[model samples]
Target chain A: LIVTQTMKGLDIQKVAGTWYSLAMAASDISLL
Target chain B: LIVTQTMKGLDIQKVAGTWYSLAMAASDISLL
Candidate 1:
């Protein structure tokens, strides 16, 4: 499955909240 | 204040830097 390790990866400034949320979501879905 | 993007995301050995440096910066002012 296509998965993003990090929503921001390097750019944690503008999208910090979204990045973290997306990363967590991706991990959870990947686990399941 | 502004935000700080991680030079990169979770990659263990991938030291955070300008992508063409030697060692990861130590000081918070320089790194952060």
Candidate 2:
């Protein structure tokens, strides 16, 4: 799962719409 | 779920072992 998907207590509503996409993209590169 | 029931990582044994207590309490209170 992406960081956004696991971030339970944090308020994601304050961020932009693409926040999860950006987080998922960054996390994907970490596996390489 | 009450706070104790959802307290996945907390050592509620040190917090009075009242996690389940709070759960049963909530149920009874709500019914009252």
Candidate 3:
């Protein structure tokens, strides 16, 4: 799966690499 | 760009269509 990114920031730049990881990182996997 | 998706839910399914939209939806665009 592809994660979309933009003129992003530091923490979120690492967040940009993977989709599910970011979701789980933020604990929003339940939303998925 | 693409927003990541999985066995996702309804509200986020619409949110799945676009990354920036979901970010803006959650008002996290500044975080980007």
Candidate 4:
């Protein structure tokens, strides 16, 4: 597994706007 | 408004692990 981290901090209010999926991956075939 | 961005890249597979919210903010109080 790859260790991951978030950059600095996050502001939830500003992030409340619409978000789109750029890419996705899943181990389960059903999740595709 | 605060402009935000994600880290360099994300490994969706590894990120599939459990995630918990530490803090949150919203324009609508109802969302709190």
Candidate 5:
């Protein structure tokens, strides 16, 4: 058997702020 | 005339960590 894990105990208030986009991969869809 | 703004000067290292999903809108595509 196998087990998968995900993120836990996230602080929404601390993470609630502006975030800058430094780099991104090329895709057919425009993310702008 | 119109003006748009985006986030600037972000610290990727500091923001590099696990994040939990609280709520999100539904879409045809998978964000996972």
Candidate 6:
């Protein structure tokens, strides 16, 4: 897991592009 | 990269135990 997080009332902005890359990578992990 | 995410105004509860496991795995990915 490149990122594991526990957030409460979490908020964020920007984090696009590579953010999508991160999501793509995470979905790949479901098989692992 | 195993997990990549962008969240906004997120909220959650519980999600312990394996939650810790997820964090540990993410740390391991840092070296990957």
For each candidate, report its DockQ versus the true two-chain complex: 0.05, 0.02, 0.07, 0.05, 0.05, 0.11
lDDT for each residue of candidate 5 in A1-32, tens digit (9 for 90 to 100) = 22222333333334534443222222222333
TM-score of each: 0.16, 0.17, 0.17, 0.20, 0.19, 0.25
Better of 4 and 5 by TM-score: 4
TM-score of 3: 0.17
Better of 3 and 6 by TM-score: 6
- TM-scores for chain B, listed for all candidates: 0.17, 0.19, 0.16, 0.21, 0.22, 0.28
Between candidates 1 and 6, the one scoring higher on DockQ is: 6
Question: Candidate 6's chain A scores what TM-score?
Answer: 0.25
Which residue pairs in model 1 clash with each other?
A: none
Tell me the tens digit of each residue's lDDT in model 2 across A1-32: 21222222322233323221211222113211
Candidate 5 lDDT over B1-32, as tens digits, reads 12122334333334434543322222222332
Clashes of each: 0, 0, 1, 0, 0, 0
Flag the better candidate by lDDT, 2 or 5: 5
Q: For candidate 5, give the lDDT of residue A21.
A: 28
Please identify model 5 stretches exceeding 4 Å from their true place: A1-5, A14-30, B1-32
Q: What is the lDDT of residue B8 in candidate 6?
A: 48
Q: Among these predicted structures, which one has the highest TM-score? A: 6
lDDT of 1 by residue, B11-32 (tens): 3343333333212222222211
Q: Once model 1 is optimally superposed onto the true structure by TM-score, how far is the C-alpha of residue A4 displaced, in angstroms?
A: 7.9
The segments of candidate 1 whose C-alpha lies over 4 angstroms from its true place after superposition are A1-9, A14-20, A24-32, B1-32
**Where does candidate 3 stray beyond 4 Å?**
A8-28, B4-32
Q: Give the range of the ten consecutive residues with the poorest summed lDDT in model 6 chain A.
A: A18-27
**Among these predicted structures, which one has the highest lDDT?**
6
Best candidate (score: DockQ): 6
Candidate 6 lDDT over residue span A1-32, tens digit each: 34554444554444322221212223223323
